[PDB]
Copies of this chain bind each other. A is one copy, B any other.
Amino acid sequence: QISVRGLAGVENVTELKKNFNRHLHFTLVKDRNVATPRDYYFALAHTVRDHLVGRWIRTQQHYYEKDPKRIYYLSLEFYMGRTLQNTMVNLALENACDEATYQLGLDMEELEEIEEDAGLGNGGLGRLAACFLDSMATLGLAAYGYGIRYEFGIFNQKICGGWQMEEADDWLRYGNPWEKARPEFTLPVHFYGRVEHTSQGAKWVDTQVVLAMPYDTPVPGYRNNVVNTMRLWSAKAPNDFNLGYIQAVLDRNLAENISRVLYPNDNFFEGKELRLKQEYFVVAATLQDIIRRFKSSTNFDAFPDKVAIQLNDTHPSLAIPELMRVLVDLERLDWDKAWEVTVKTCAYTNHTVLPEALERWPVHLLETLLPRHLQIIYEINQRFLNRVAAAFPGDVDRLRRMSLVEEGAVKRINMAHLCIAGSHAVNGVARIHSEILKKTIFKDFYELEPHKFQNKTNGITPRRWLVLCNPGLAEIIAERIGEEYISDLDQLRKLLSYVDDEAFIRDVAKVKQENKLKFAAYLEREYKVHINPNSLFDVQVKRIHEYKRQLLNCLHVITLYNRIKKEPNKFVVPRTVMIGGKAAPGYHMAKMIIKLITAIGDVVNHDPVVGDRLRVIFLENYRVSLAEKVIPAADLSEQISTAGTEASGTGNMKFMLNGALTIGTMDGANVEMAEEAGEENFFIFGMRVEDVDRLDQRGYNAQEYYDRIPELRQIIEQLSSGFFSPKQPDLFKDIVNMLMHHDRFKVFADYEEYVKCQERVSALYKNPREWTRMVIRNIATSGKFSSDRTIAQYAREIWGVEPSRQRLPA
On whether the beta carbons of B250 and A264 are closer than 8 Å, the reply is no
Tell me the A161-205 residues at the B interface (CB within 8 Å).
165-168, 170, 173-175, 180-181, 183-184
A38's partner among B57, B152, B184, B236 (CB-CB below 8 A) is B184
- Name the residue on B nearest A241 (C-beta): B168
B interface footprint on A586-613 (CB within 8 Å = 1, 0 otherwise): 1000000000000000000000000000
- Name the residue on B nearest A150 (C-beta): B249
On whether the beta carbons of A26 and B50 are closer than 8 Å, the reply is yes
Q: How far does the Cβ of A145 sit from chain B's closest Cβ, in whole Å?
A: 18
Q: A152-B249, A243-B165 are in contact. Are A29 and B50 (CB under 8 A)?
A: no
A260 to B236, CA, bound (A): 14
Tell me the A227-258 residues at the B interface (CB within 8 Å).
236-237, 239-241, 243-246, 248-250, 252-253, 257
- Name the residue on B nearest A238 (C-beta): B168
Q: A241-B168, A243-B167, A244-B586 are in contact. Are A36 and B184 (CB under 8 A)?
A: yes
Q: A29-B56, A184-B38 are in contact. Are A168 and B243 (CB under 8 A)?
A: yes
Residues of B within 8 A of A717 (CB): none
Is A585 close to B, CB under 8 A? yes
On whether the beta carbons of A239 and B170 are closer than 8 Å, the reply is yes
- Name the residue on B nearest A246 (C-beta): B261
A586's partner among B245, B261, B585 (CB-CB below 8 A) is B245
Is A25 close to B, CB under 8 A? yes
Is A465 close to B, CB under 8 A? no
Is A291 close to B, CB under 8 A? no
A167's partner among B29, B38, B239, B244 (CB-CB below 8 A) is B239
A261 to B237, CA, bound (A): 15
Q: How far does the Cβ of A263 sit from chain B's closest Cβ, in whole Å?
A: 7
Is A31 close to B, CB under 8 A? yes
A166 to B243, CA, bound (A): 7
Is A54 close to B, CB under 8 A? yes
Residues of B within 8 A of A53 (CB): 25-26, 29
Residues of B within 8 A of A249 (CB): 152, 168, 260-261
Residue with the greatest number of chain B CB neighbours at <10 A, chosen from A30, A56, A261: A261
Is A357 close to B, CB under 8 A? no
B interface footprint on A756-783 (CB within 8 Å = 1, 0 otherwise): 0000000000000000000000000000
On whether the beta carbons of B180 and A29 are closer than 8 Å, the reply is yes
Is A155 close to B, CB under 8 A? yes
Residues of B within 8 A of A61 (CB): 31
- Name the residue on B nearest A257 (C-beta): B250
Is A274 close to B, CB under 8 A? yes
A586 to B53, CA, bound (A): 50
Q: How far does the Cβ of A624 sit from chain B's closest Cβ, in whole Å?
A: 20
A244 to B274, CA, bound (A): 14
Tell me the A553-581 residues at the B interface (CB within 8 Å).
none
Q: How far does the Cβ of A371 sit from chain B's closest Cβ, in whole Å?
A: 25
Residue with the greatest number of chain B CB neighbours at <10 A, chosen from A173, A239, A244, A249: A249
Residues of B within 8 A of A29 (CB): 53, 56-57, 180
A174 to B173, CA, bound (A): 19
A54 to B655, CA, bound (A): 50
Q: How far does the Cβ of A37 sit from chain B's closest Cβ, in whole Å?
A: 11
Residues of B within 8 A of A56 (CB): 29
B interface footprint on A9-39 (CB within 8 Å = 1, 0 otherwise): 0000000000000000110011100001010
Tell me the A108-164 residues at the B interface (CB within 8 Å).
152, 155-156
On whether the beta carbons of B264 and A245 are closer than 8 Å, the reply is yes
Q: A167-B239, A168-B252 are in contact. Are A245 and B155 (CB under 8 A)?
A: yes
Residues of B within 8 A of A25 (CB): 53-54, 57
Residue with the greatest number of chain B CB neighbours at <10 A, chosen from A173, A181, A246: A246
A184 to B39, CA, bound (A): 10
On whether the beta carbons of A585 and B174 are closer than 8 Å, the reply is no
Residues of B within 8 A of A237 (CB): 168
B interface footprint on A53-84 (CB within 8 Å = 1, 0 otherwise): 11011000100000000000000000000000
Q: How far does the Cβ of A481 sit from chain B's closest Cβ, in whole Å?
A: 38
- Name the residue on B nearest A25 (C-beta): B53
On whether the beta carbons of A585 and B261 are closer than 8 Å, the reply is no
On whether the beta carbons of B585 and A244 are closer than 8 Å, the reply is yes
A246 to B262, CA, bound (A): 9
Residues of B within 8 A of A240 (CB): 167-168
Tell me the A604-633 residues at the B interface (CB within 8 Å).
none
Residues of B within 8 A of A257 (CB): 250, 253
A263's partner among B175, B246, B253 (CB-CB below 8 A) is B246
A153 to B184, CA, bound (A): 21
A168 to B167, CA, bound (A): 32
Residues of B within 8 A of A36 (CB): 184
On whether the beta carbons of B57 and A31 are closer than 8 Å, the reply is yes
A69 to B282, CA, bound (A): 54
- Name the residue on B nearest A165 (C-beta): B243
On whether the beta carbons of A260 and B250 are closer than 8 Å, the reply is yes
A243 to B168, CA, bound (A): 8
A272 to B30, CA, bound (A): 40
Q: How far does the Cβ of A11 sit from chain B's closest Cβ, in whole Å?
A: 19
- Name the residue on B nearest A186 (C-beta): B173
Q: How far does the Cβ of A184 sit from chain B's closest Cβ, in whole Å?
A: 6
A627 to B717, CA, bound (A): 83
A272 to B244, CA, bound (A): 13
Residues of B within 8 A of A30 (CB): 57
A249 to B244, CA, bound (A): 26
Q: How far does the Cβ of A141 sit from chain B's closest Cβ, in whole Å?
A: 21
On whether the beta carbons of A181 and B170 are closer than 8 Å, the reply is no
Residues of B within 8 A of A174 (CB): 183
Residues of B within 8 A of A586 (CB): 244-245
- Name the residue on B nearest A586 (C-beta): B244
Residues of B within 8 A of A264 (CB): 245
A264 to B165, CA, bound (A): 41
B interface footprint on A261-283 (CB within 8 Å = 1, 0 otherwise): 10110000000101000000000
A566 to B236, CA, bound (A): 56
On whether the beta carbons of B261 and A250 are closer than 8 Å, the reply is yes
Residues of B within 8 A of A241 (CB): 168
Residues of B within 8 A of A250 (CB): 257, 260-261
Tell me the A692-736 residues at the B interface (CB within 8 Å).
none
Q: How far does the Cβ of A453 sit from chain B's closest Cβ, in whole Å?
A: 36
Q: How far does the Cβ of A666 sit from chain B's closest Cβ, in whole Å?
A: 36
Q: A175-B181, A181-B175, A253-B253 are in contact. Are A585 and B245 (CB under 8 A)?
A: yes
A722 to B533, CA, bound (A): 94
Q: How far does the Cβ of A335 sit from chain B's closest Cβ, in whole Å?
A: 37
Q: How far does the Cβ of A343 sit from chain B's closest Cβ, in whole Å?
A: 34
Residues of B within 8 A of A244 (CB): 585-586
6 smallest beta-carbon distances between A and B, as pairs: A245-B585, A249-B261, A253-B253, A168-B239, A167-B239, A174-B183
The 17 sampled A-B contact pairs (Cβ below 8 Å) are: A29-B57, A31-B57, A36-B184, A38-B184, A152-B249, A166-B243, A166-B245, A167-B239, A167-B240, A168-B239, A168-B241, A168-B248, A173-B183, A244-B586, A245-B585, A250-B260, A253-B257
With A165-B243, A245-B586 known, 18 other A-B pairs at CB within 8 A are A25-B54, A25-B57, A29-B57, A31-B57, A152-B249, A166-B243, A167-B239, A168-B252, A170-B239, A174-B183, A175-B183, A244-B586, A245-B264, A246-B263, A246-B274, A249-B260, A249-B261, A253-B253
